[PDB]
Structure 1
Amino acid sequence: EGTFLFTSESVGEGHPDKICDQISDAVLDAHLQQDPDAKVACETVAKTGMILLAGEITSRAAVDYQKVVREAVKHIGYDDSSKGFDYKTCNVLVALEQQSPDIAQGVHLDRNEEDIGAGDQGLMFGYATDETEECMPLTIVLAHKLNAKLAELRRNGTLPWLRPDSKTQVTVQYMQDRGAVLPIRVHTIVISVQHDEEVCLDEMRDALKEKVIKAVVPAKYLDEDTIYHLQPSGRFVIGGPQGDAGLTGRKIIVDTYGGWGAHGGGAFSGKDYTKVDRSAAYAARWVAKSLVKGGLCRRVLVQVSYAIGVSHPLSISIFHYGTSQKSERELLEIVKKNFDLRPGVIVRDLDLKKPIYQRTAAYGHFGRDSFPWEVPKKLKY
């Protein structure tokens, strides 16, 4: 009684949608290295033999798109036709134009940086939960770590039949606790990973349990009843873009909270700070995490929204699930007094002209690596 199941998923660095996110952010970073004020809206599409860049960039940088794209694919591990994709020999097509002058004039032309308008309308959420030290849902943390473990064992050569494309999924049984949530046990794990033509199914399934799951998931969460779906399709030799087209911004729940909290729909990768889809979502995470680490809440969801061309958010809302002694109205006043959510101020607080974005584009944007939005602000109230 009072228990429920909840499932989240993650994907690996060579999952075709994630390839696109990483390439889009490699392009962003390449621009920002030369022009910190570059306006970038770079979408990537991947299919057999093809990376296409489409979108809008206005920048003083001189960027070699062939080199940037191919080096990103190399880093991911697609380096031979036997793996289904090769950075050395794939097609890289570019359909990039300047940013629309109508957008530019309405957003940032002749505006003081702090008073730049939002680059679009939209809604964004931030979420934090005390169930893990990194203030993230356990389901998504574990799912990400299973993909990272696969990449580790591929790159270190101990499971050399692995290829870069993978997906994982973790179902946890939770107990509710005064609006907070408490993980009890892992109910089901799925792992699917691209593999070579020689390794057999039983070798893979044994390795995925013993060398992947047991190396990631604490034994206290695994029991005789846990269900394992390891290579459930039976065969995954064809993978990467050859198996499934990829696009930027098609893993937005993997990028965020694994189904927990809420999402406003905007993708992160390929976008400079003036695109509030990214900057305001990062700021909202920073607010949520600051509220939890500051001891005001155990679990919290923050919504913000914007209109194109308008600097201040149109709305700010907080929901604490019953996990604060303060009302949400009081928390909102605390947030108002401690944070300025104009994009031209967020950029300063979170250092969003720095070319660190490719690092955000796999394994989730939140809960990792002490990025600026992961360092709580000390709140005055």
Structure 2
Amino acid sequence: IEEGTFLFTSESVGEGHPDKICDQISDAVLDAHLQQDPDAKVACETVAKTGMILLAGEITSRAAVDYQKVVREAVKHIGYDDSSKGFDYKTCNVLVALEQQSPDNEEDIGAGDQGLMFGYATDETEECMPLTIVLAHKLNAKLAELRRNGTLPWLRPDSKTQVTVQYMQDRGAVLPIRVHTIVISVQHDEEVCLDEMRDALKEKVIKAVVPAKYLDEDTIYHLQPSGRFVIGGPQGDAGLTGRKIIVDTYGGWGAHGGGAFSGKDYTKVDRSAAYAARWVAKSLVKGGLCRRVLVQVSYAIGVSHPLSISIFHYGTSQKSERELLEIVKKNFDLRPGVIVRDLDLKKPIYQRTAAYGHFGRDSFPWEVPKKLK
């Protein structure tokens, strides 16, 4: 019945979306530093516009990093290798305005600020993520796969997707019923016709990614909805690091306290503690303690242990929220310097996080649920 259902929408963007190009370059720079100096402090912003990658920010590191190589290899990997595509790693301007200095008990490091971090998890997918954002990410990944394997050789790197799912409530848990609307816009070459693109997007992309049970004759498809998308990448739109923070996290679900992730080393609590909060939420759901949960961790400036933790289970547990809090405190140490140790965050793992979401992928330590005792 209409009266018990609701719609929810999330979006994702491809590796060649100009904002995502900047996130990936910022984390490539972070990784390059961490490979040589595990204690590097990095706050690297990237700006991309026609013919230009500009790096700005502050670094304290012993590393000697070849920025030409880091930037150009990232752009090559993304797939911008010719003027005909709007951007070329071989010929773009790389401007380095980074200010790098040399440097002069980790468990007791105080929080740098008073602040709030959220973790979220939901049993609606195997990834413990909202279906809307999982499907949106996977659609972009599929486009990249078919571009790179030459199945759809007219594809270019810039893309955006958006998925609206129709849900019912099930005692605080959310149950996906059907995909209501899908949007896909993807950059393309000058030869391919609109109808062939739209057919490919439906048959080779959407039907390869979205389970058939969620698609029906009423599902609305907006495929290349503005018509041609030849001009794209940084030529079409300036990009900046930290401008896809909702794409990076929960797609509008749960909550967000405000910090961007990319270009920031693990001593930035707004990255590492966000990862740890996710780890807690996912562990609660995978442990069968709730179906859906929002974990809200507050820190007091200069204090290592969290000031307060609140667990909101949306009514999806037999346990009280106080009981869940006891379980969390028994099983997790959310001091910033201890999170870094437990999730091994000094490793150069960050470039992989910078497209397709920081959450919902099994290859990251914060996505391996902890067995709860």
Q: Give the TM interval when normalised to the shorter protein.
A: over 0.9
Instruction: Judge conservation of contact 1:175–1:182 (CA < 8 Å) in 2.
Output: yes
Q: In structure 1, how many angstroms separate the alpha carbons of the residues matched to 2:301 and 2:159? A: 37
> What secondary structure sits across from 2:363 in the alignment?
coil
Query: Which residue pairs with 1:373 in the alignment?
Result: 366
CA deviation string 1:132-152 (max 9, x = no partner): 111011111111110011001
- Which range is displaced more, 89-98 or 4-13? 89-98
Q: Describe the shift of the 1:10–1:84 C-alpha distance in structure 2 as closer, same or farther (beyond 3 A).
A: same
CA deviation string 1:77-128 (max 9, x = no partner): 0111110011111111112124799xxxxxxxxxx21112334443211100
CA deviation string 1:190-212 (max 9, x = no partner): 00001111111111111111111
Q: In structure 2, how many angstroms separate the alpha carbons of the residues matched to 1:58 and 1:308? A: 23
Q: In structure 1, how many angstroms separate the alpha carbons of the residues matched to 2:69 and 2:110? A: 33
Q: CA deviation at 1:369?
A: 2.8
Instruction: Judge conservation of contact 2:61–2:101 (CA < 8 Å) in 1.
Output: no
- Which range is displaced more, 323-332 or 68-77? 323-332
Q: CA deviation at 1:338?
A: 1.4
Q: In structure 2, how many angstroms separate the alpha carbons of the residues matched to 1:7 and 1:100? A: 46
CA deviation string 1:292-314 (max 9, x = no partner): 11111110001123345432223
Could you say what the CA RMSD is over the residues aligned between the two structures, in angstroms? 1.4
Instruction: Judge conservation of contact 1:149–1:212 (CA < 8 Å) in 2.
Output: yes
- Deviating 4+ runs (over 4 angstroms): 98-101
Instruction: Judge conservation of contact 2:61–2:102 (CA < 8 Å) in 1.
Output: no
Instruction: Judge conservation of contact 1:119–1:274 (CA < 8 Å) in 2.
Output: no
TM-score by length of 2: 0.96
CA deviation string 1:325-381 (max 9, x = no partner): 11112211221121111111001110000101101111001111331101111222x
Q: In structure 1, how many angstroms separate the alpha carbons of the residues matched to 2:366 and 2:247? A: 18
Query: For structure 1, which runs of at least 5 residues remain unmatched after alignment?
Result: 102-111
TM-score by length of 1: 0.94
Instruction: Judge conservation of contact 2:29–2:44 (CA < 8 Å) in 1.
Output: yes
Q: In structure 2, how many angstroms separate the alpha carbons of the residues matched to 1:364 and 1:122? A: 23
> What secondary structure sits across from 2:97 in the alignment?
strand
Instruction: Judge conservation of contact 2:6–2:168 (CA < 8 Å) in 1.
Output: yes
Query: Which residue pairs with 1:278 in the alignment?
Result: 271
Q: In structure 1, how many angstroms separate the alpha carbons of the residues matched to 2:59 and 2:305? A: 24
Instruction: Judge conservation of contact 1:125–1:303 (CA < 8 Å) in 2.
Output: yes
Query: Which residue pairs with 1:315 in the alignment?
Result: 308
Q: Describe the shift of the 1:308–1:294 C-alpha distance in structure 2 as closer, same or farther (beyond 3 A).
A: same
Q: Describe the shift of the 1:309–1:90 C-alpha distance in structure 2 as closer, same or farther (beyond 3 A).
A: farther
Q: CA deviation at 1:54?
A: 1.1
CA deviation string 1:231-262 (max 9, x = no partner): 00111111001111111111111111111111
Query: For structure 2, which runs of at least 5 residues remain unmatched after alignment?
Result: none
Instruction: Judge conservation of contact 1:267–1:277 (CA < 8 Å) in 2.
Output: yes
Q: Describe the shift of the 1:100–1:250 C-alpha distance in structure 2 as closer, same or farther (beyond 3 A).
A: farther
Q: In structure 1, how many angstroms separate the alpha carbons of the residues matched to 2:74 and 2:243? A: 18
Query: Which residue pairs with 1:245 in the alignment?
Result: 238
Q: Describe the shift of the 1:98–1:304 C-alpha distance in structure 2 as closer, same or farther (beyond 3 A).
A: farther
CA deviation string 1:26-60 (max 9, x = no partner): 00100000010111111111111111111111011
Instruction: Judge conservation of contact 1:124–1:277 (CA < 8 Å) in 2.
Output: yes
Q: CA deviation at 1:158?
A: 1.3
> What secondary structure sits across from 1:98 in the alignment?
strand
Q: In structure 2, how many angstroms separate the alpha carbons of the residues matched to 1:205 and 1:298? A: 37
Query: Which residue pairs with 2:321 in the alignment?
Result: 328
Instruction: Judge conservation of contact 1:39–1:99 (CA < 8 Å) in 2.
Output: no
Query: Which residue pairs with 2:158 in the alignment?
Result: 165
Instruction: Judge conservation of contact 1:164–1:240 (CA < 8 Å) in 2.
Output: yes
Identity %: 100
